[PDB]
Amino acid sequence: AITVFSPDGRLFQVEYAREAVKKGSTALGMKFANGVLLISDKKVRSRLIEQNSIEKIQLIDDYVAAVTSGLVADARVLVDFARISAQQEKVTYGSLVNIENLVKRVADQMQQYTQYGGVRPYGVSLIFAGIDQIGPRLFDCDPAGTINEYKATAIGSGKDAVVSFLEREYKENLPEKEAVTLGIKALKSSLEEGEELKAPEIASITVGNKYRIYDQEEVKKFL
Amino acid sequence: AITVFSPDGRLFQVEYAREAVKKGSTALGMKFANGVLLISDKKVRSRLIEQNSIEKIQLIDDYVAAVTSGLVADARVLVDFARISAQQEKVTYGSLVNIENLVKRVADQMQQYTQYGGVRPYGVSLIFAGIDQIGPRLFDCDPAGTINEYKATAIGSGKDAVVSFLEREYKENLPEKEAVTLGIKALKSSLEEGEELKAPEIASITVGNKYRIYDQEEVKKFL
Amino acid sequence: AITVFSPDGRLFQVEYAREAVKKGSTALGMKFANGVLLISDKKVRSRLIEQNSIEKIQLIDDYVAAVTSGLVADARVLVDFARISAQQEKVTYGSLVNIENLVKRVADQMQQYTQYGGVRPYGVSLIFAGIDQIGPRLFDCDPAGTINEYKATAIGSGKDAVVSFLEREYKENLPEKEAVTLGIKALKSSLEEGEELKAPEIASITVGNKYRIYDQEEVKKFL
Amino acid sequence: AITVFSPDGRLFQVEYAREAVKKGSTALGMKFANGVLLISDKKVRSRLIEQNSIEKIQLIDDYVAAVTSGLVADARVLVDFARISAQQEKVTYGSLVNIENLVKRVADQMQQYTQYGGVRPYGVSLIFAGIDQIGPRLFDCDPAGTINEYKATAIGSGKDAVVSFLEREYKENLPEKEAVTLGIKALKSSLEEGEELKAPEIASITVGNKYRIYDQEEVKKFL
Amino acid sequence: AITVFSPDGRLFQVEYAREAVKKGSTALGMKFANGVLLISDKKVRSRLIEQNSIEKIQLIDDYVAAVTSGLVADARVLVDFARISAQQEKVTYGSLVNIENLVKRVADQMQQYTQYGGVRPYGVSLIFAGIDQIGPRLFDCDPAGTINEYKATAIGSGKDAVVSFLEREYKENLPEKEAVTLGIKALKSSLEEGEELKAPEIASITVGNKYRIYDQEEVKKFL
Amino acid sequence: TTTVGITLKDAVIMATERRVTMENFIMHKNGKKLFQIDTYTGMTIAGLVGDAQVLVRYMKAELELYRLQRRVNMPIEAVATLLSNMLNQVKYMPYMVQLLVGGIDTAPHVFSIDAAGGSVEDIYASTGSGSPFVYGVLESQYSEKMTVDEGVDLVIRAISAAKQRDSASGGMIDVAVITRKDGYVQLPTDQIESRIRKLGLI
Amino acid sequence: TTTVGITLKDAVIMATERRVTMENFIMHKNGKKLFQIDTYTGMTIAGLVGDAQVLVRYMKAELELYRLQRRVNMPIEAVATLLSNMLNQVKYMPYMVQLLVGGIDTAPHVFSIDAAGGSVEDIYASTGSGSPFVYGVLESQYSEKMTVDEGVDLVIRAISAAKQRDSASGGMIDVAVITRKDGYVQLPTDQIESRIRKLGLI
Amino acid sequence: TTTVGITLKDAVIMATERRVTMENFIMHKNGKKLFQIDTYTGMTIAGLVGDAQVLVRYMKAELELYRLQRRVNMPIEAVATLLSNMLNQVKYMPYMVQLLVGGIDTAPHVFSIDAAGGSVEDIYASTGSGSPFVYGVLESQYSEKMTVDEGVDLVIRAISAAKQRDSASGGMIDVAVITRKDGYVQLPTDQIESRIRKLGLI
Amino acid sequence: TTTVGITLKDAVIMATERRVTMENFIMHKNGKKLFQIDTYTGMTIAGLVGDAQVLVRYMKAELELYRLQRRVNMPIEAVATLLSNMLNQVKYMPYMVQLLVGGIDTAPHVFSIDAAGGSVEDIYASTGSGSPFVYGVLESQYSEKMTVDEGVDLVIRAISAAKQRDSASGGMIDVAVITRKDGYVQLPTDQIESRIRKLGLI
């Protein structure tokens, strides 16, 4: 086995996977009036890249979306797992009543890869956001399988800076437009010194409606 | 294999898991007149956290509840296991006569993960409390799978201080209200020096009734 | 593999498990006129402990009982195994003619965990006592799977002192009351210097009868 | 396990496989007006080699082609896997609508070989190009299983030089002939100092048509 | 696992197996007018050996033959595998259209033994020669599973010297007799200093005919 | 056997008789065929007794576990869907039962489920050998505007008619009323008897 | 075969005859069909002898293990439930038996269980080919207010009537009385014979 | 049961009745046999209810997952092909159903699929016991040049004729219209009733 | 169903009709029974539609993969051999089909394959319920020296005769011509109709 207890009761392989997540791109999510939104920073690298299929925000179904950070290959595997898990619940019961159950299924898979030798832990953190029978939900999940629910949270390299900005300026029941504006300011605050902020990805959903992916022009009128 | 005997007859991986439990939040339980109660300390960290789904006290069924400390991801796995185990007993026999059997099933699972290579031991301690055919019961369970039954016990970082307070002031057949008052004092005694005591989680059950989760206002009138 | 031969032909992991047994509580058993008895020392630790479910003496069936020492979690697993083994014999044949066969099944399980890599050896010693077609029997079993039959024997931390006391004062065909009195004296001789002897657990069985668990008052009239 | 996290959150075995890819031959692909093209450098080694079955560009089906770099034996295994995966999709649905799904199946296989002990990661990078329902596509895939989509990209030893040349001179919607001419110039720019450029392999496909393998004479009229 | 990537991207166990092949006997093959031929050096060791069953050239079927070098025991296993693979193709389709497919099946087996822990790589190199629907074919295969097609090639200890001789004197469409004469000269050039050249093994096949094993007298009239 | 379930404005009423035929005679005159399986959910069973009792135990465990894991009761339609999947999965080795599921989540619901997993929602339904007699009563007398008290009298009359004509049915009538305000309430037999006298059914 | 179990105020009475047909003739006139399976629990068997004897051994082991692991006796309803699950699990490859389970946990109980796992509690029950004759006697003479002594006479008369009319039944009658105060008590044959003379049954 | 699907210039029209026979009588007069399974795809079911409902759930999950993974809707022909593979894979342990799949990807399409996985595209098709009566109406009155409004009237008349002659069919008619411009639109019952009066079908 | 395949000097001609019986009536008048499975290879199907369509998909995938892996098309005899192995491997759980495979590798070939994997090469062959009528036409009129144009007229006449006498056959005739110079060419229906008028077949 690889993931074993250290003398002080720590799992080093889990800690090291957390370092891998610290290198990923920054993403954030927050709850607003009757809804929830997700933002992911799309740093431009080269003109030669097809900047249409980046798709940092991935739909799990019409009412659930996720954003990830860290090892991108491991992240794709977990997103696929979440989509299959969501479809299995709908087949068995006819609907998805609580998003928290779906997150726990994903986090249980991640926990399993920290207890059994012969495999390594996923180097990914995820944020899940959507609408269920209880209303707007917002969770994250770390490589160890730890789950928490937030009014607002962030992942990635700039997570510490974005959270501190949200720790001072975030409000509840904000309108969609104002909430999106607040999100950009938090994202801009973590930017590398005097770097410019390129067009990020925006998605939002409101009670009674399906997910909405913001168009490029709509995002353009926010910088 | 990882968990092997040391020259003096000790299992180091089991000992190290006990260190992980020492970092968990403090929880306690005690028996009172015709019932048993559970208390878990809900330390507030950030405003951004949704302090409704913390749910430190988890119901196994309507008459059995548990509180855990240590690796939270491992704790969620064991709680799920306990719920499935409880439902299996009810299907086979039509009822749950002795809570001790349910605890042993959980502790046997934990013991297994200390004897076979390729896996590591759960880094969790649990307290089970409820009513069965024998009456009010209160058990704990450690990472090695050791089980004990108590009139009153505690787990977590402040366990040593809380137990010492209970070792001097605990009484039997105390009324519910007085027992709850005593529990808060024990919890306050282990607090970090002059730290304040935020609203914890309270649950109780009485012979003939189901479990009761204390409301926020009810907990508020105890500080 | 972990349990391998040392250059001098010793199995270190087996030896180390024997050290774990040396830390367990002291227990003893002896044969008397038409019967056998078991005694286990119940050291009191805290008032907060429910001193009713300690049950150091465990019934395998109505005519067979056991006491263990060492890793308590491993001991519970082996006791469960013995109970299932005993029930399987009764189903196949309709009765249990020789207790020695049941002990060998338990010791074969323990021997297996010393020869195959990927597992560690049980850190337990056991004493089995009961009545079968041959009459009163008394065996012990060590972590290696070694079995012996005795007129009187002891396990645990105080085993060396208790055996030496029995080596000089034990008699055969003693009446039940006198045999129990002799057992207390042996137990008191191993006590930590001038420590007091708290109420231990007593069980006995006589040819033609089932096992008897001594009541607290009956034990009280022996100190 | 072999592929484990380093203290800084890196997978060394994955990094080392990337070094193996750096030793492979240089290949490139770019999108042009209503199509996509692939170029692979066929360095001549010996007259004794049968320079007809080199086939650096491998057809996955009539509309999808790939080029690889690195461990050639591992590359052949992955190409075979891609062909079987493509045929399975056609059997199930009757057609292949999105090439991206086929690439993800290949990259998921490669990701699996980085998380489970007992196997090593594939030392290959691949470029997939073809026409699907969305139009012309161009992807690459690295040993970790990372996927990206490009207007133009390169793999192999000369990848850094070729990409820099494309980073300055590449245009969109270029005619086939001009795009092929641009590709040769990028390939010639990475050549070892004053080495000559031997006849490489060229393949192209246009919306509505199948893949075309350029004949030797056609390639000859490009140097 | 044993075969893992080195820091510079190399598989040491594969490299070491290549050293084992370097100790094997020298063999060669070349294409001639409407056919292909194989030569293997039969160094005489002792009179006590039965020099009839050496059979360095092994028939895979009537139209396909192979020669190997390196670990002779591993070579026998791979030859057996090739014969079974060839028969399976004939059963499924009724014929063998392309020898290259048969070689890839053998090389895929060899590649597998370089990626999965618990096994070591075959220490063998092989040359396959025969006639199929495309005509005369000549391949080799190395321990890594690398395949190449040649007009002429060699394996074994003297491979470097024989190839250099062929690199300067080999011609195409040579008659059978002249091609065989050229092969002997290449074999003699690699001989240990002034060692004599004993009667080697010769096999050849021509379009429309089956394989021919040269008789001892026929080989004798070539030295 | 005769079971029935009807929906009213904001209530569900379910009822059965109690006769259990075994060994081809009336061995048990006081069986149980109506079960509460959740806080606001009930279930009636017809067919093989052993198969039905096993299914009741499975449903109680699954619904209880669902409510603990997701903090809300399983919706009635999801209860029917879960049952449909389990029955269909063994359709060639089937539970030979006919089931009725009724309850309240945000509106009253009654579902009928057959042995092959076919599940259909209806305003009212009836199962067992006495069911055709019940449908005659319901067709001529049921009204959506009935009060709860009127509905209880209706199901009692319907089952009484079945007991007069179906030899497989008999015994005392059990009735359950499900509302959001009061939950699952099993009517005590004393009121059932009192209504039977008041309705002239002796 | 004829077996019977009845419940009184604070007691359970169980009784069988002893004739075991094998090879289509009366091979064994002195079989055993009534077994104690727990401290306050009894069991009667009808049907295939081999299947029934295997089930008796399984139940003795399970109940004994249960009592050791949980420090209390298994409740009678749980005993019936455990049996129901085992029989239903092999319903298509079944134990061809009919069983009666009776005992005391906090009140007397009698349960009837069929081959498919159907389990129903009743105040009294009877199994075997002689059972219809027993039900006639019980229907006309059973009373809940009977003393234990009256109940023993009743079951003896019921089984004697079955022996006069069912050729598959015969032999001496075995009777067991279960109470909390006295536990499982097998009546000695001498009192059974004495009662038979006193009741005029020769 | 009667289901029908027809293709027009740039539209697909699908329609069913609602009668669900169970226990050999008309238990449910208001069943559901027409389902939307994708943005521009619909499905009708005939045969065993349990088998059909399971298939509907499977198709909804697969199509939804497909659209998420590949960013486009599954083409109608691929929908039919996927169904054909699943049914044929269990041909000796089959889903006893007859299915119609219709929708728009770049042109309208209707596919008929049988229990053994045979899939055939057609301009129009009909399933269920009432289908032969529908084919008579379609053969004499269908025209490819009909407007959407004319097509809706045609399918309504065809199903009404089947209800007059096939006892297994009955109830209110459900109709869905699929176009690229408007998507999957379930016609409200008020217009269905209004058309029924206008066409003289009472 | 009626399918036919004939060999000429350097060509293969294959042809079918289009009627697909399902649910014991003429549900689809425009089915497809002739498929191109390789560059110079064709296939006709008779029997169970679902089994045949699955086989067509399998053959397209295998032949395509073969050609990619070995750089040449699979020879026609190898195509027949591969089919023979697959069918025989499940002979006791069989695909209930009759197949014709035709194509050109270095000479024209036609193979007939039955459900048990028996494969026989022939100069011409015919399958389906209309085949006996086709063999009568071919026996009296076929000649190895016919031109391609004469052969197309011959197969058209043969299938037309079958349609007059086999009720299971009907619809428009599809024809494919396979040559090395031109490859697999599906004759457009306009020429098929024109030939039908010219031959006096209305």
Nearest by Cα to D65 from D36, D88, D89 = D36
Which chains are within 8 Å of A by 3+ CB pairs?
B, D, F, H
**Cβ neighbours of D207 (radius 10 Å):** 11
Between the CA of residue F132 and those of B193, F123, F142, what are the distances in Å? 76, 16, 15
Which chains form contacts with chain F, at 3 or more CB pairs under 8 Å? Answer: A, B, G, H
Number of domains in chain B: 1
Residue I107: CA count within 13 A, CB half-sphere: 9
H64 to chain A: which residues are within 8 Å by CB? 61-62, 87, 90
Q: How far apart are CA D168 and CA D160, in angstroms?
A: 13
Residues of I in contact with H125 (CB under 8 A): 27-28
Q: Chain C residues with CB inside 8 Å of B117's CB?
A: 2, 117-120
DSSP string, G56-70: HHHHHHHHHHHHHHH
Contacts of H112 in chain I (CB under 8 A): 22, 27-28
- CA pair distance D60, A146, nearest whole angstrom: 42
Helices (H), strands (E): how many in chain C? Answer: 6, 10
Distance from CA of E57 to the nearest CA of I (A): 26
Write the residue in A48, A72, A74 that is nearest to D150 by C-beta: A48
For D82, the token pair is: 């891609």
Spell out which chain G residues touch chain B, with contact meaning CB-CB distance below 8 angstroms. 69-72, 74-75, 77-78, 81-82, 85
Preferred mutation among B52, B63, B91 to probe F, highest tally of F CBs within 10 A: B91
Q: Do H28 and F132 touch (CB under 8 A)?
A: no
CB atoms C84 and G69 under 8 Å = no
Chain-centroid distance of CA G83 in Å reads 15
Specify the number of domains making up chain H: 1
Q: Nearest chain B Cα to A105, which residue?
A: B77
SS3 F196: helix
Give the β-pairing of E147-149 and E152-155. Answer: unpaired
A143 touches chain D (CB under 8 A): no
Of H72, H75, H82, the CB nearest to D92: H82
Contact H91 I20 (CB under 8 A): no
> Which residue range is the domain that position F71 belongs to?
3-199
Task: State how far residue H162 is from chain D, nearest Cα, in angstroms.
Answer: 35
List CB contacts of H53: < 8 A, sequence separation 6 or more.
F84, F88, F117, F118, F119, H45
Question: Is-contact A9 B23, C-beta < 8 A?
Answer: yes
What's the Cα-to-Cα distance from C43 to each of A213, C25, C69, C212, D149, rounded to whole Å? 68, 8, 13, 22, 71
Q: Which residues of I touch D54 (CB under 8 A)?
A: none
SS (H, E, C) E34-98: CEEEEEECCCCCCCCCCCCCCCCCEECCCCEEEEEEECHHHHHHHHHHHHHHHHHHHHHHCCCCC
Contact at CB, A8 and B16, closer than 8 angstroms: yes
Question: Which chain F residue's Cα is nearest to B79?
Answer: F69
Residues of D with CB under 8 A from a CB of I: 59-62, 83-84, 87, 90-91, 94
- Regarding chains H and F, contact by 3 or more CB pairs under 8 A is answered as yes
Record: contact A153-B48, CB cut-off 8 A? yes
How close is the nearest chain F Cα to the Cα of G197, in Å? Answer: 31
Is B187 at the interface with chain C, CB within 8 A? no
Residues of C in contact with G57 (CB under 8 A): 90-91, 94
- C223 by Cβ neighbours in 10 Å (0-12 / 13-18 / 19+) ranks as exposed
G61 vs C61: CB contact, 8 Å cut-off?
A: no
Chain H residues whose beta carbon lies within 8 Å of the beta carbon of residue D97: 70, 72, 74-75, 78
Q: What is the DSSP string of F109-172?
A: EEEEE-TT--EEE-SEEEESTTHHHHHHHHHHH--TT--HHHHHHHHHHHHHHHHHH-TT--SP
- Cβ of A91 within 8 Å of Cβ of H64? The answer is no
Q: Who among G61, G68, G69 is closest to C91 (CB)?
A: G61
Name the one residue in this structure whose structure tokens are 């007691």.
G11
Phi and psi at residue G65, to the nearest 5°? -65, -40
| Contact of D124 with D71, CB cutoff 8 Å | yes
- At residue D157, the 3 state secondary structure works out as coil
Pinpoint the alpha helices (H) of chain D. Answer: 12-22, 72-93, 99-112, 159-169, 176-189, 216-220
H121 neighbourhood in chain D, CB within 8 Å: none
- Give the containing element (helix H, strand E) for E131: strand E124-132
Show Cβ contacts of residue C62 under 8 Å, excluding neighbours closer than 6 positions: C210, C211, G64
H28, H53, H54 member nearest F112 (Cβ): H28
Nearest CB to G57 within list C83, C84, C91 = C91
Q: Which residues of B touch F60 (CB under 8 A)?
A: 90
What residues contact residue I109 under an 8 Å CB cut-off, 6+ apart?
A: I7, I12, I76, I77, I102, I103, I121
8-state DSSP, E195: -
Q: What is the CATH number of the domain that holds A121?
A: 3.60.20.10
Residue H167 phi/psi, 5-degree rounding, is: -65, -25
Q: Please, what is the Cα angle at A130 between A125 and A132, to 5 degrees?
A: 130
Chain A residues in contact with chain H using a Cβ-Cβ cutoff of 8 Å: 59-62, 80, 83-84, 87-88, 90-91, 94
Beta-carbon separation of F85 and H54 below 8 A: yes
Q: Which domain holds residue C149?
A: 5-221
Nearest of D214, D206, D182 to residue D57 by alpha carbon: D214
> Using the beta-carbon criterion (under 8 Å), do F78 and A100 form an inter-chain contact?
no
Closest-CA residue in chain I for D82?
I65
CA gap G161, G159 in Å, rounded: 5
Active site residues of I: 1
C-beta atoms of B49 and A111 within 8 A = no
- Judged by CB atoms closer than 8 Å, whether chains meet at A97 and F70 is answered as yes
Residue B17: strand, helix, or coil: helix
Q: What is the CATH number of the domain that holds I39?
A: 3.60.20.10
Q: How was this structure determined?
A: cryo-EM
Apex I142 CA angle, I139 and I144, nearest 5: 130
Half-sphere exposure of F157 (CA within 13 A, CB side): 17
Chain F residues in contact with H23 by the CB 8 A cut-off are 98, 114, 127, 131
Give the whole-angstrom CA distance, residue D54 versus residue D40: 11
